[PDB]
Amino acid sequence: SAEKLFTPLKVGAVTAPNRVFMAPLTRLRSIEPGDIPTPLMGEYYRQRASAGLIISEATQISAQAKGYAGAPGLHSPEQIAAWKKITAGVHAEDGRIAVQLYHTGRISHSSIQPGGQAPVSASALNANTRTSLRDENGNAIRVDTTTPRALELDEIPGIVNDFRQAVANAREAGFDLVELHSAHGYLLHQFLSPSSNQRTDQYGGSVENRARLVLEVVDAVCNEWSADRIGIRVSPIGTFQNVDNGPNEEADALYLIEELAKRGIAYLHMSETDLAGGKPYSEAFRQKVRERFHGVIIGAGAYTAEKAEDLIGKGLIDAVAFGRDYIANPDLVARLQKKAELNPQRPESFYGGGAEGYTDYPSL
Numbered sequence: 405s406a407e408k409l410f411t412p413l414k415v416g417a418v419t420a421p422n423r424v425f426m427a428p429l430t431r432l433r434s435i436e437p438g439d440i441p442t443p444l445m446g447e448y449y450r451q452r453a454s455a456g457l458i459i460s461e462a463t464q465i466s467a468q469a470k471g472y473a474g475a476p477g478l479h480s481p482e483q484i485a486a487w488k489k490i491t492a493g494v495h496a497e498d499g500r501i502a503v504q505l506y507h508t509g510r511i512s513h514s515s516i517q518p519g520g521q522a523p524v525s526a527s528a529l530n531a532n533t534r535t536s537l538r539d540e541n542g543n544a545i546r547v548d549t550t551t552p553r554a555l556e557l558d559e560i561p562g563i564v565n566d567f568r569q570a571v572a573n574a575r576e577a578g579f580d581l582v583e584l585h586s587a588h589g590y591l592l593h594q595f596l597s598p599s600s601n602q603r604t605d606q607y608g609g610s611v612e613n614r615a616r617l618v619l620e621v622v623d624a625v626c627n628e629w630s631a632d633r634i635g636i637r638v639s640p641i642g643t644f645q646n647v648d649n650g651p652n653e654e655a656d657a658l659y660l661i662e663e664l665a666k667r668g669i670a671y672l673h674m675s676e677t678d679l680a681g682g683k684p685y686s687e688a689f690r691q692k693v694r695e696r697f698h699g700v701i702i703g704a705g706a707y708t709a710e711k712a713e714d715l716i717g718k719g720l721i722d723a724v725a726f727g728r729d730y731i732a733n734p735d736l737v738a739r740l741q742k743k744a745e746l747n748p749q750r751p752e753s754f755y756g757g758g759a760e761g762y763t764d765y766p767s768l
């Protein structure tokens with residue numbers, strides 16, 4: 405009964421009524437062709453609209469940005485039109501929704517790239533992981549990633565412009581905020597990490613060079629919309645989908661966070677550990693982050709409500725994003741508030757398929 409989870413929080417331009425956020429969750433149920441959000445997706449999001457803030461599944465900024473069969477995009481008219489329905493449905497329920505925008509870079513497969521060609525990255529190094537394709541029956545299948553081509557220097561302004569344009573499209577589509585996906589070994593993170601970035605131009609080497617692209621993107625989208633509409637997800641300590649953060653991860657993380665603070669953006673979303681686990685954040689490191697960033701800090705990664713209360717109470721974070729508990733509990737806020745039991749998770753239906761394991765987890 406004590407409790408800060410159920411108190412309001414100003415998040416840039418909007419106000420969440422509680423601190424229980426829905427983490428971005430790739431579910432691979434979009435229509436192909438066209439990578440189009442669906443009415444079923446609308447329903448799923450509408451069921452969860454009691455969240456303080458919903459953060460959408462990763463959404464491609466361009467066709468080249470596509471990594472997964474069934475992931476949606478936000479570049480085409482049909483995508484914009486479908487997303488508008490989805491956000492209206494969330495708003496119909498007095499919810500708020502951020503779109504997570506990404507470019508997958510090297511976590512992709514030639515068969516879903518334009519012209520069937522190699523995906524792009526900082527450097528020509530395979531991700532050494534799998535993405536998800538669809539088979540002949542439309543079912544999700546995990547397949548090894550295709551080796552990428554290194555971006556040419558003269559292609560980089562295009563990538564920045566695709567982010568900027570996607571953010572314009574997000575504003576039109578009715579999202580409340582945008583979250584740039586600079587985590588989890590996707591394109592922005594592929595530049596940030598020395599493991600994935602062997603460039604010798606101004607986009608690789610030093611931490612200032614490795615953070616250049618993400619900071620260009622931040623600046624571009626701040627300019628396009630408003631800094632109080634922009635959040636960012638980072639995963640800068642540990643290893644995430646085979647991408648570590650190099651041999652100076654803490655100092656490099658703090659450099660990036662100082663840079664982001666200067667832009668006055670709505671929020672910093674920290675993905676603390678990979679689904680396969682990692683070492684917990686020290687409170688010392690939490691305090692170093694806190695003093696470097698003056699907006700909202702969202703924590704994520706196998707959180708319990710207790711851990712969330714403990715850390716908000718300590719003044720170290722403002723909110724928590726829950727992932728898998730959100731898949732299985734559309735009314736998670738109510739269940740956490742009432743200390744109800746949660747629905748059991750069905751991980752076999754996290755990716756692909758239809759309504760089963762998607763919209764069929766009941767509320768109280």
Ligand SMILES: Cc1cc2nc3c(=O)[nH]c(=O)nc-3n(C[C@H](O)[C@H](O)[C@H](O)COP(=O)(O)O)c2cc1C
Pocket residue numbers: 427428429430431460461462504585587588637675679704705706707725726727728729754755
């Ligand atoms: C099915 C699944 C899909 C995910 N998709 C994304 C994604 O789209 N973007 C992202 O940044 N993280 C993604 N994640 C990570 C979640 O946002 C979250 O950080 C993770 O599940 C850890 O929190 P949890 O223990 O509360 O589930 C995904 C996780 C799972 C289980």
Ligand SMILES: O=[N+]([O-])c1cc([N+](=O)[O-])c(O)c([N+](=O)[O-])c1
Pocket residue numbers: 430462472506536585588644645679
């Ligand atoms: O498996 N997945 O399909 C998946 C997808 C995304 N994403 O943004 O496209 C992630 O960030 C994560 N993630 O790292 O947790 C997983």
